[PDB]
Amino acid sequence: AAKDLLKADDIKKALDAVKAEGSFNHKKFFALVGLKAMSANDVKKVFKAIDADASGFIEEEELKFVLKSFAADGRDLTDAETKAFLKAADKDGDGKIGIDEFETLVHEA
């Protein structure tokens, strides 16, 4: 759904930089693809897609396929890479990244 809403080549540079098995962080990746360039509104729409279980929330499982909107199966978290996104974006440390938390980590990425 966000594959046509992106630049295409921007997703090939971020994923090509993290493809390693633990080379993903979340800042250099999103900063590359260009998700922060989107507008807070078009960001709430990017998150609505991150929301895998349609629960207006980004749970740890979402993090596993966080880059799914860009690729049904693009970057497959290594597990440790998923433990970074969760402890790098979850500021309140609640276990769920709502929008403001997500759009805040997508723009500061």
Q: Is 35 or 66 the residue whose CB approaches Ca ion more closely? A: 66
> Which residues 63-92 are close enough to bind Ca ion by CB under 5 A?
90, 92
Q: Is 53 annotated as belonging to a binding site?
A: yes
Q: Is 57 annotated as belonging to a binding site?
A: yes
Residue-wise over 19-50: b if at least 16 C-beta within 10 A, else e?
A: eeeeebbbeebbbbbbbeebeeeebeebbeeb
Q: Which tokens go with 17? A: 């930089």
Is residue 101 within the footprint of Ca ion (CB under 5 A)? yes
Q: Is 23 annotated as belonging to a binding site?
A: no
By CB under 5 A, name the binding residues for Ca ion: 53, 55, 57, 59, 90, 92, 97, 101
